[PDB]
């Protein structure tokens, strides 16, 4: 799966500031990691629909968030997603 | 001719079989309900196993049999009484064991077991 | 990686040379599939509750190791290959659970 380490590197590389956690930008990047690894996961096990549910709720979250960020800090809405290539 | 051997009791709702085997397991003689002259549910009776088990033993010892280990399979109302006369027959009945078969949820049974 | 308990059961009849030779295969195959040993516990022949390979006995090994999680399966598939290898059970090593 994802490694605590791999999780940290992201965390740090998106934290608003040193001891940053649980912030929009990071809160999206984690999901983005889980998502991108479910999709890359599901591209084989095409039958495991069960898992495919949370994958939606995941993106549901991230889509819920992003729009919040969209609502509040625009410039920050782009830059981010652009750093993750997320808009389809 | 053999002195020690075996005895299997196939006990079923509809009948009861008594077959006696050599130590290796090769049958030497056998008997069940109808052999004593019964036809039908009357076969599914203990007293049948008696004559059945008895008539099988009687014929068995005639070949020299004197000892046999016992083996019972099934859930028949003629089962135990069969185990009886065998002991009260003329054989040493060296042991009793229930090797009744039972799956572990394998093949489906007929409609009348559900 | 991950640490498991390689549980292997081998033909009880083989001679010593017939014996460890399979192990060498195991040892190598182990090594080849990125296996790093730790403990070990070769318990010799032993009584079984029921005949494997229609053979009542069975000579067991036992390896705690730590290999790449993404390479365990191809192993046992490599170990079960031996006509003398007869049981092969890998188990994710786990903290003991005690009673009383």
């Amino acid at each position: 799966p994802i490694t605590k380490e791999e999780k940290q590197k992201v965390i740090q590389e998106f934290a608003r500031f040193p001891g940053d956690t649980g912030s929009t930008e990071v809160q999206v990047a984690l999901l983005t990691l889980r998502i991108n690894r479910l999709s890359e996961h599901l591209k084989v096990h095409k039958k495991d629909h069960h898992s495919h549910r949370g994958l939606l709720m995941m993106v549901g979250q991230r889509r819920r968030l992003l729009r919040y960020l969209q609502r509040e800090d625009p410039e920050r809405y782009r830059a981010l997603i652009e750093k993750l290539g997320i808009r389809g | 001719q053999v002195a020690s051997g075996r005895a299997y009791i196939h006990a079923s709702y509809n009948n009861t079989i008594v077959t006696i085997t050599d130590p290796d397991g090769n049958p030497i003689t056998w008997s069940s309900g109808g052999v004593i002259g019964y036809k039908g549910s009357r076969k599914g009776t203990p007293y049948a196993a008696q004559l059945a088990a008895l008539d099988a033993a009687k014929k068995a010892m005639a070949y020299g049999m004197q000892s046999v280990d016992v083996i019972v399979r099934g859930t028949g109302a003629g089962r135990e009484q069969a185990i009886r006369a065998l002991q009260a027959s003329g054989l040493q009945v060296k042991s009793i064991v229930d090797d009744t078969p039972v799956p572990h949820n394998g093949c489906r049974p007929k409609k009348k077991f559900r | 990686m991950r640490r498991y308990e390689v549980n292997i059961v081998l033909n009880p009849n083989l001679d010593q040379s017939q014996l460890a030779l399979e192990k060498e295969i195991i040892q190598r195959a182990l090594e080849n599939y990125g296996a790093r040993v730790e403990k070990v516990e070769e318990l010799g022949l032993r009584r079984l509750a029921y005949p494997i390979a229609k053979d009542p006995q069975g000579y067991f090994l036992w390896y705690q190791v730590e290999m790449p999680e993404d390479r365990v399966n191809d192993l046992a598939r490599e170990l079960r290959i031996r006509d003398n290898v007869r049981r092969v059970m890998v188990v994710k090593s786990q903290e003991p659970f005690l009673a009383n």
Binding site: - | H104 | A49, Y50, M89, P96, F97, L98, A99
Partner: protein, 68 residues
């Protein structure tokens, strides 16, 4: 005559502890419940799986003949 008392410390996961594990299988090789083993929920469950694994390695039986 519950069994858990009959023993002290012992690994529910020592799936090779035949002499111990084989203690919970009635003389017909079956697994024994909880009104008979004194084990609890989480406990009980952690057993069988332990037993089973061995019952696959060739240690414990899947079943046994019965003697009277």
């Amino acid at each position: 005559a519950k069994v858990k008392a009959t023993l002290g410390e012992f690994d529910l996961r020592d799936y090779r502890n035949v002499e111990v594990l084989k203690r919970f299988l009635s003389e017909t090789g079956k697994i024994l419940p909880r009104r008979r083993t004194g084990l609890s929920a989480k406990e009980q469950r952690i057993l069988a799986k332990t037993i089973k694994r061995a019952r696959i390695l060739g240690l414990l039986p899947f079943t046994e003949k019965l003697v009277r």
